């Protein structure tokens, strides 16, 4: 996250931190995700497409820091890794960039709700906030485009939803952006998601409830003028989600 604020998991209790194990025992952070039911985390396919072996991954819930054990955190293995079969990556855009991870602790249990572990609601079909609405994004991604390391502390920021009409302008993304994607940015281009934030939640207070409106997918750079963050539009994938869940 470029700009924004440091935060803690209590403020973002649906946030899932996804890591990959390597042969020698080292673990590296991969992507974010969101807990949508006790057994299911939703993320982005592009995070996993090159290494689709579910045994390689670890999922933490209730975790505020990248490389430390926060009190009340829960560690999970991935029981099923489901990537979208129509995922594709073009010049700029990632299409159908959505994935599901069925999580299970070593004892075979799903998430236990607590102050630091809560599910986030899904939207209803084709039901998104109006353009101009403020939404929050959360992640352990880069704080600057030139960083090669991720911050140890979880961050959040607040961005505004951008119309499809604006986002498909030539100096924005043109025809690369589709109706199954959502654009969001800072009006002054000072805060944005970045590399390492992929898979994590774009959350909007919708109709009296915190709702998973988007999934961090792609963008041209980070916090660049006229280059919004692009998010998988969750409200256009409900048949897919419920079919696998």
């Amino acid at each position: 996250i470029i700009g924004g604020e440091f935060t803690t998991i209590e403020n973002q209790p649906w946030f899932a931190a996804i890591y990959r194990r390597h042969r020698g025992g080292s673990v590296t952070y991969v992507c974010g995700g969101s807990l949508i039911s006790p057994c299911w985390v939703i993320s982005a396919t592009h995070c996993f497409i090159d290494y689709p072996k579910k045994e390689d991954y670890i999922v933490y819930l209730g975790r505020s820091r990248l490389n430390s054990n926060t009190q009340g955190e829960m560690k999970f293995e991935v029981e099923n890794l489901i990537l979208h079969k129509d995922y594709s990556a073009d010049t700029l855009a990632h299409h159908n960039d959505i994935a599901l991870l069925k999580i299970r602790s070593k004892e075979g249990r799903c998430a236990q709700p607590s102050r630091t572990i809560q599910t986030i609601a899904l939207p209803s079909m084709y039901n998104d906030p109006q353009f101009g609405t403020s939404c929050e994004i959360t992640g352990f991604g880069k704080e600057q485009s030139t960083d090669y390391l991720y911050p140890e502390q979880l961050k959040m920021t607040v961005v505004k939803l951008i119309s499809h009409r604006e986002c498909q302008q030539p100096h924005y993304y043109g025809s690369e952006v589709t109706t199954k994607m959502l654009c969001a940015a800072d009006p002054q281009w000072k805060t944005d998601s970045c590399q390492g934030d992929s898979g994590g939640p774009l959350v909007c207070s919708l109709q009296g409830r915190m709702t998973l409106t988007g999934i961090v997918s792609w963008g041209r750079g980070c916090a660049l003028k006229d280059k919004p963050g692009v998010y998988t539009r969750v409200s256009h994938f409900l048949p897919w989600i419920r079919s696998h869940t």
Partner: peptide
């Protein structure tokens, strides 16, 4: 094949 989407991925 290098594609720019490798770099746009967040």
């Amino acid at each position: 094949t290098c594609r720019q989407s490798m770099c746009t991925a967040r």
